[PDB]
Amino acid sequence: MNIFEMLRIDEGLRLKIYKDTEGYYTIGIGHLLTKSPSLNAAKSELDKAIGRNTNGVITKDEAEKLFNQDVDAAVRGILRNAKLKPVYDSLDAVRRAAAINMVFQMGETGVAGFTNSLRMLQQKRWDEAAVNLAKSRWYNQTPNRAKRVITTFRTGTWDAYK
Ligand SMILES: [Cl-]
Ligand SMILES: [Cl-]
Numbered sequence: 757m758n759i760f761e762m763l764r765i766d767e768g769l770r771l772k773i774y775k776d777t778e779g780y781y782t783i784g785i786g787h788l789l790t791k792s793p794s795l796n797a798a799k800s801e802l803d804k805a806i807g808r809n810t811n812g813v814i815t816k817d818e819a820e821k822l823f824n825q826d827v828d829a830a831v832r833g834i835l836r837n838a839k840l841k842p843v844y845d846s847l848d849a850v851r852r853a854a855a856i857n858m859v860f861q862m863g864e865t866g867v868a869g870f871t872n873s874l875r876m877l878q879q880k881r882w883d884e885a886a887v888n889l890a891k892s893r894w895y896n897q898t899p900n901r902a903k904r905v906i907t908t909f910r911t912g913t914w915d916a917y918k
């Protein structure tokens with residue numbers, strides 16, 4: 757397993773615009789198009805992202821390309837965030853994948869707000885962090901996914917994903 761497979765499991769793959777868990781226009785492997793309620797808006801951003809007139813539909817290859825860019829950007833965002841970087845650099849490879857997952861889902865900003873959880877992770881107090889991480893909107897809104905990522909920081913293995 758790795759970050760790509762992990763996220764492909766959590767996000768799914770849809771080739772037509774769809775609404776995510778928050779009701780936002782998305783396509784592909786969890787590629788958020790816009791927070792606006794306008795479908796036209798969404799179509800416009802899609803076309804812009806892909807470079808053609810898509811008419812709200814994309815190919816598998818195009819979804820994968822957006823996915824690669826999105827992972828890449830998620831990593832670079834962590835490395836660029838003064839609050840995130842130190843934590844991320846202190847983690848083992850498995851746990852780093854979990855941190856990327858969170859960033860991809862809620863943004864760097866969003867993650868950067870888990871102050872207490874971050875320090876616990878940095879200190880390697882796994883169970884404690886796991887408990888603190890679940891005390892969140894994130895966890896109450898998408899509990900199964902949250903549980904998978906949480907177990908991953910807890911154990912440092914991919915068990916949640918097998
Ligand atoms: Cl884009
Ligand atoms: Cl979920």
Ligand SMILES: [Kr]
Binds near residue numbers: 834840841843844855
């Ligand atoms: Kr992180």
Ligand SMILES: [Kr]
Binds near residue numbers: 858867870873
């Ligand atoms: Kr976190």
